[PDB]
Amino acid sequence: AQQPWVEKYRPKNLDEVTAQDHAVTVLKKTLKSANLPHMLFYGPPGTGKTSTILALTKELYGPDLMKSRILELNASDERGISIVREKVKNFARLTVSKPSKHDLENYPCPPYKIIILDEADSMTADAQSALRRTMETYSGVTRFCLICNYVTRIIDPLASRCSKFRFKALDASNAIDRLRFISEQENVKCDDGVLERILDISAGDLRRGITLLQSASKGAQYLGDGKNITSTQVEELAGVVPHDILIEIVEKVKSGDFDEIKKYVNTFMKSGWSAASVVNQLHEYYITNDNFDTNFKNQISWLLFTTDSRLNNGTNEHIQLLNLLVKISQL
Amino acid sequence: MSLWVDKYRPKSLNALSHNEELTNFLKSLSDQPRDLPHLLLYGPNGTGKKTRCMALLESIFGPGVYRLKIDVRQFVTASNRKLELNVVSSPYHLEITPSDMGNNDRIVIQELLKEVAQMHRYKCVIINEANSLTKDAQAALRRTMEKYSKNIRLIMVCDSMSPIIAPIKSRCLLIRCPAPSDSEISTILSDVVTNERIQLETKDILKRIAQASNGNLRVSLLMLESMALNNELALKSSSPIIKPDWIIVIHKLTRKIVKERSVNSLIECRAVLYDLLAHCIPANIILKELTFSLLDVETLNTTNKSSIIEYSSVFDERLSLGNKAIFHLEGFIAKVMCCLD
Amino acid sequence: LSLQLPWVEKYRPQVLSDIVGNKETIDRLQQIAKDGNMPHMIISGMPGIGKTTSVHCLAHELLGRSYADGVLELNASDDRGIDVVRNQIKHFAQKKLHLPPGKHKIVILDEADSMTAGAQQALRRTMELYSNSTRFAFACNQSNKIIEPLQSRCAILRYSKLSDEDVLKRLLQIIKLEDVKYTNDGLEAIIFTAEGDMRQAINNLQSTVAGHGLVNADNVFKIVDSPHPLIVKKMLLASNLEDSIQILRTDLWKKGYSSIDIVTTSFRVTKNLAQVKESVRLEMIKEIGLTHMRILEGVGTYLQLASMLAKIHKLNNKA
Amino acid sequence: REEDKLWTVKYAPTNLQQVCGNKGSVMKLKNWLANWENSKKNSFKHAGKDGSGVFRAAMLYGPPGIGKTTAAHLVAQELGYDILEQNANGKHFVIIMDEVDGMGVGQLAQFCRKTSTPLILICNERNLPKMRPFDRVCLDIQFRRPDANSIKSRLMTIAIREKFKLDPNVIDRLIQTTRGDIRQVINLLSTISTTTKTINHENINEISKAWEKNIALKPFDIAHKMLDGQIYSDIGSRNFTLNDKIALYFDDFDFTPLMIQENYLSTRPSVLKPGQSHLEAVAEAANCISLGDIVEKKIRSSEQLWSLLPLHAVLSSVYPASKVAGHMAGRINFTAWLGQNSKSAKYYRLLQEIHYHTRL
Amino acid sequence: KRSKENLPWVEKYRPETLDEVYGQNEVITTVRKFVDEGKLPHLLFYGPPGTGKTSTIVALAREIYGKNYSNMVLELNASDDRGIDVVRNQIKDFASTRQIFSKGFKLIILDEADAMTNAAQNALRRVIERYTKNTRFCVLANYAHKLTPALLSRCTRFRFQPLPQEAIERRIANVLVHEKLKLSPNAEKALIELSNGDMRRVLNVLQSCKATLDNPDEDEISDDVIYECCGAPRPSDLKAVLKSILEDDWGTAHYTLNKVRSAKGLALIDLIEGIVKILEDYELQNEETRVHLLTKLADIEYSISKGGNDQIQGSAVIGAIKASFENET
DNA sequence: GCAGACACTA
DNA sequence: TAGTGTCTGCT
DNA sequence: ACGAGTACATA
DNA sequence: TTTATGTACTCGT
Ligand SMILES: Nc1ncnc2c1ncn2[C@@H]1O[C@H](COP(=O)(O)OP(=O)(O)OP(O)(O)=S)[C@@H](O)[C@H]1O
Ligand SMILES: Nc1ncnc2c1ncn2[C@@H]1O[C@H](COP(=O)(O)OP(=O)(O)OP(O)(O)=S)[C@@H](O)[C@H]1O
Ligand SMILES: Nc1ncnc2c1ncn2[C@@H]1O[C@H](COP(=O)(O)OP(=O)(O)OP(O)(O)=S)[C@@H](O)[C@H]1O
Ligand SMILES: Nc1ncnc2c1ncn2[C@@H]1O[C@H](COP(=O)(O)OP(=O)(O)OP(O)(O)=S)[C@@H](O)[C@H]1O
Ligand SMILES: Nc1ncnc2c1ncn2[C@@H]1O[C@H](COP(=O)(O)OP(=O)(O)O)[C@@H](O)[C@H]1O
Ligand SMILES: [Mg+2]
Ligand SMILES: [Mg+2]
Ligand SMILES: [Mg+2]
Ligand SMILES: [Mg+2]
């Protein structure tokens, strides 16, 4: 193509949205009717909220009408209280543009405009409080849509005024069909479960899985030998730690000597592997194994959670993982 | 340039001898530049991530990329706090680093991206030190590189993604630049000293330099230049390693902490902290290497070291969630002296 | 339709004797109204205790039937500024009006706490120039914002909370003048729901009588709830954790109180708490403020309040 | 008009015998003004014994209502001068302008530097940043809280003229309640005598409790008050409550938490727990300063959550000083972070100045 | 625009008469006897979001006044500016001038009044007090801590209780009658525990369920439809997850939680509140167990709000529950 | 707390 | 010329 | 009268 | 230093 896969296989229509169907059916049957409520799309990133709302916009009014009937606001522009109090209020105050005979003949063209605030969780509390009565005052002439991957940031009135559509994460089971379809459409070879492993690596994000699949395909055509893609290639491309290094990490932990642990931690950090992946791998090794005791499992789960939460708030990965290994070594 | 670190910098993938698997992946991506996703190069410092991004650009954009220039623009924010952050312009690619005061990086990034969004044909953008972003410029990028996916390509150069939020990692490709082991570092230093003129008494000096650098090519080259100038281009194994005054005073501070757990000792430690923060050194790495120095003392026990690393992690999260860098360092040092006593 | 006048102005005092509260300030105002040479005063304190109606009644007693000729009613409602207020004060003070031989032109500046420093320092000049002709009067919610020299050149008559006796007397007067049935339980319910405030007390009484009619404690409870500081103080001083949790949910989560208001009230109560050791209060405030931050990013979950109470009891138990 | 005049203006000092307290500054100003013409004939080459000859203009400061303007007027009129006010020897016009701090300050300082007429400045604060141009261009005549004897005699005269009973041993409480404000004392006597003509020791405690002239403490005074082991003891906490400690913070809330962190190390604690060493107490105290670091970050951020200001007092000012409170070994040290920040910012500016110069 | 039926259930239905407001029976009858008798004071309406404040005040204005109340009543909200300039110009001119349409008094609506500045409230309190003879002020606020205590004392405070089961049941019955829809008892119960005392939430979920069915008519919405459309974990599913956590080993419980999350795309956070809600009525003999449970779950939801890895957070929930219950003996 | 200055008496 | 005693500035 | 530049408070 | 929102003020057109 001429542009990446993530924006190449975006769902053009509502039916192309896989996994998420509990909201797609609602939007599909709202296409025939016209009582569209205020939408609050909340879920993990990469679950297709923006794709779903763009598909709904395209089906509701058609490509011609959405240019003058859809207002797009995001963090790329100003989102202060003055902008909320002026631009959105003015846009909701105006009457709807007259639909064309062509548009009404082909598209249903409901008589209202939609203002979509993607990344709505980034707005200040003052702006959210100001943007409360703009919906109810001008509901007969326009509707609002909110997209935000943290629903908790949204205040209670703003969340109440909109309908909450939860976009569930695209795991291995739900999103296997979409990745498979991408595989035969792009002629990407899967050996046994490469797609399933790629979906396992991604934290419910199909965009990440599609990106890893695209990278594996790029390697596949660069080698040019026409060989079957293995799970080793996609796990190395993702950046996860090989299992043998995890095993020797556990062996060093079981020893209990601080000096060897610190030396091997420095050896591991000069490799550059991300500490979040190490926490995840230590989790899936220690929890799944049966030789460790229940109290040890509870302690290590709490320690891994604390390490991951601290890694979310910046900090240095070296200190976090070294302290994690020291903690689990003295349990 | 007279400096030794930047003269011997690869200008293409074929000239890159840092690693081979990553070079293979980079030229695999460069084989089909059409479907190029947003990139995120991560790893320890000194691995040539900037150089790899450059060489990928000339692999994609061809020659002339290193012909950069400096352009000055005007930025407006709240009140009248005028900002004049420079953009390092060039044909095709445009390079800019968000090295602002860390409070109003939104306006610069947004203005530059909307200005370059006017028009092979897609313009790549690399910004450095992306880890220390204020979580708001990342929010701007989250939509800016999503909507402008056919005209603007965005590349992350950062050493970690722990401060980086999830959506930025989601809409970018995660590729890793590792640090080399001692042997190929010694090999590249031997190649350099073969290119210019240094007489080596023993080959072990390069191995000792590699051990001192602890996986950093820029540090290794700067150290090699320092030894070459100090020893008059005659390397000797008896010559000791040269350490920064920063690490020297940290070592003296650690010895002071371990030798006297008194409040007055904490006063001169606070004075040293004042001076070092006045030397414009980020406090996170200061705390990191300070703790590594406390863990590198023989007389320390195991419970003391465990408590030291615990307080290290706690004050690391406190330093991440704060602006007063001196407060967390002083608190951590006070807890260290409390643990030792 | 046109309503009857509210109970505010239907029973606003007209003379200084009608105002209840602290007897010293009121009878000082009465004596200085008998004399005539009223000195400049700054009135401050919690609002609704007679900080403005007392000044109005004093001005009425000073200026008889010529009140409208030589009284300049100023407030934040009309307009405030430096070179607007000083212009109007200069215009009013430079009016050579034939006052009685022992009277001055009283100027009342209601709600002047939010006034700028320049306006206050110009008011100082207007005082030191036209003290022989006009005498000012300040009624503010907080005298701290007022610059110190203004309070230096004034007769400070700061009031306090009205006791239950004064509120009871005034409410009985309103009841007898409005023909309202009352009960002692209803009276004390109005007293507690007043928080020592006249306007809130009369509002609650008017609501009760125009609603349930009979003024009893139960009807007042239906029309208005108990103040949140008392319930929060009972929350943060309970013995067991389950009792505190159930009090929290039943009294401030099933009654619709917003979580941020709950945490702010907890902070204020702990800051103004007695019978507790100082370090205990400080650490309770630290953890309550941590919960306050947690509410502030957007997490208004009931479990955040539950964890706040759990940590409160953990610190109270002394490990 | 008569018998309808305020006591503060009807009982006004007619001569410098009538003014009470700060008499040394009165002679200083009198000798400055009397020798001003001598200095003018000397072309301001050198000063006299008091070091006031070289000064072109004089200047007064102190608590409000202490008699600065009154003493200036009386000095001008006894020596013989034409009093004139430009604020917002007998035929020589003297400029008596008040409230220099009430602001132009540079132009006023220049006019003070070059003045062909006697000039007197009256203000309440000298160390203000806006008063920096007036640091070395005006005389440093200083007034203060006056002695409780001459004002006592003046109050005896005023009371025996106004016919109301009082006790000799009330001047001390009257002066300390009003922070040495004589005008407020006159206003208090008038206000009480309107109703109570028996202002004595039996009523003076309620009088003080109704008329405390509360004034905000300077940062240094805040630090000393906050770093006192008495106010954190069981007995001393009742007098100076936690609310008062929070209220003390808000006087200089920008500078309060920086001062506590700077000198919580130099004070020996007096409320030490059994087993709590001076080093261990600092470790907990420094932890709370880092705990208060997050709150300051959130308040002064893009969110602007200024309802959290009382929280920043407890974590950063009150609790850190609540465990190391006691008698201080040394002196109050001003925070060095502000000087460090300015030095680092220029060093940060120099860090990115040449770096972008040599980037290409 | 294009008939009233072209509106969401939250906005198509909106009360215009005081009799169409349930739940706040005490407040509605008190204000009815305020306005019919003629002794309506200045109002302060306080309650949770979406509990019928502005609907109540608009219905009150329609009841007292005529249809044409454009110049009779002024509505002010945070959608437009509400600085002290607004109070000193628009409110000033509205309250100062006697009514032009009629000869009666006036009413000014301070909608979401908890979002104005302190100086605005300081000017507004005196605006209320000077011109209370011919103008009344009704204050709509969700947060009472952003209002100065003087504004609290001026207007009588009406606490809007959250709407109980009866109000929700009558309202859903009315909207089912209006829209020709049928509901199963379990579906309306799920609406009861999901609405959280809000008309907006239950009406939006009902609209989504009506749009869920392939045929809106002759089809009944069940509780399964509620749970799938709103993405709400089933109570039986939540209790099964809790039982597996509390009785199985670290492999069985982890596998069960992952299978539950993956089967229907459940959210871990909503699972956390489900477990928490089913945990208060669980008797704990150790008081410290409650402390550890509450604090650990609070940290876990804080991390979820900040985001991160979902499986690690789920195992964190499992470990927190197991360790806290390990305190049991 | 640490000086520094301004009286009162001597 | 030198003890007490108190108010004040350390930015 | 209204707009723009500057400064201060935000318990 | 901080960092938007709001208020204030005076200068200028
Ligand atoms: N259900 C789905 N079916 C098909 N593709 C999907 C689905 N969900 C996500 N995708 C793909 O995921 C990629 C990004 O989708 P987005 O719409 O950006 O998700 P998102 O919720 O907007 O993530 P954000 O904006 O960072 S919160 C595109 O390539 C989509 O095709
Ligand atoms: N002591 C009192 N006796 C009788 N009525 C009183 C008294 N104090 C207040 N009121 C009533 O309160 C109303 C007037 O309130 P104000 O005195 O103007 O409030 P305030 O005390 O001035 O507080 P602020 O700061 O001005 S809001 C009238 O209805 C009076 O009848
Ligand atoms: N030493 C004194 N003896 C007798 N009366 C005094 C004395 N000092 C002040 N007063 C009285 O208090 C009034 C205060 O007058 P001013 O000298 O103008 O006050 P001030 O000290 O200059 O403070 P400012 O400038 O007004 S803030 C005088 O007019 C007298 O009535
Ligand atoms: N008792 C009730 N009877 C019928 N509908 C109600 C009732 N209470 C609330 N509603 C509905 O709730 C919807 C939204 O509530 P509103 O009254 O418009 O807003 P609010 O309750 O004042 O809260 P805010 O301030 O707008 S977030 C309205 O459209 C009403 O239809
Ligand atoms: N393969 C290589 N050959 C020669 N020099 C290299 C190589 N890799 C890296 N370098 C050196 O690294 C320096 C730049 O490193 P840099 O990009 O700053 O690392 P990082 O991005 O990790 O900080 C260049 O001056 C270059 O000389
Ligand atoms: Mg999106
Ligand atoms: Mg009043
Ligand atoms: Mg004066
Ligand atoms: Mg409303």
Residue numbers in the entry:
A (entry chain D): 23 to 353
B (entry chain E): 1 to 119, 133 to 354
C (entry chain B): 5 to 323
D (entry chain A): 292 to 379, 415 to 429, 436 to 692
E (entry chain C): 7 to 335
Manuscript text:
The eukaryotic clamp loader is Replication Factor C (RFC), composed of Rfc1-5, belonging to a large family of proteins involved in diverse cellular activities, referred to as the AAA+ (ATPases Associated with various cellular Activities) family. RFC uses ATP to assemble PCNA onto primed sites for replicative DNA polymerases δ and ε.
Indeed, we found that RFC can bind up to two DNA molecules at the same time, one being the well-established site wherein a recessed 3′ ss/ds DNA binds inside the pentamer central chamber, and a second site that binds a recessed 5′ ss/ds DNA at the Rfc1 “shoulder” region outside the central chamber. Helices α4 and α5 of the AAA-ATP domains of Rfc1-4 bind and spiral around the template 3′-DNA1 strand, similar to the T4 clamp-clamp loader system. The α5 Arg-434 of Rfc1 inserted into the minor groove of DNA1, the separation pin, Rfc1 Trp-638, is equivalent to the separation pin observed in the bacterial β-clamp loader, disrupting dT-19 and dA-20 at the 3′-end of the primer from the template, and the two separated bases are stabilized by the Rfc1 Phe-582 and Rfc4 Lys-275, respectively. In the 3′-DNA1- or 3′-DNA1−5′-DNA2-bound structures, the Rfc5 β-hairpin plug becomes ordered and inserts into the major groove of 3′-DNA1 located in the central chamber. 5′-DNA2 binding does not markedly change the RFC structure.
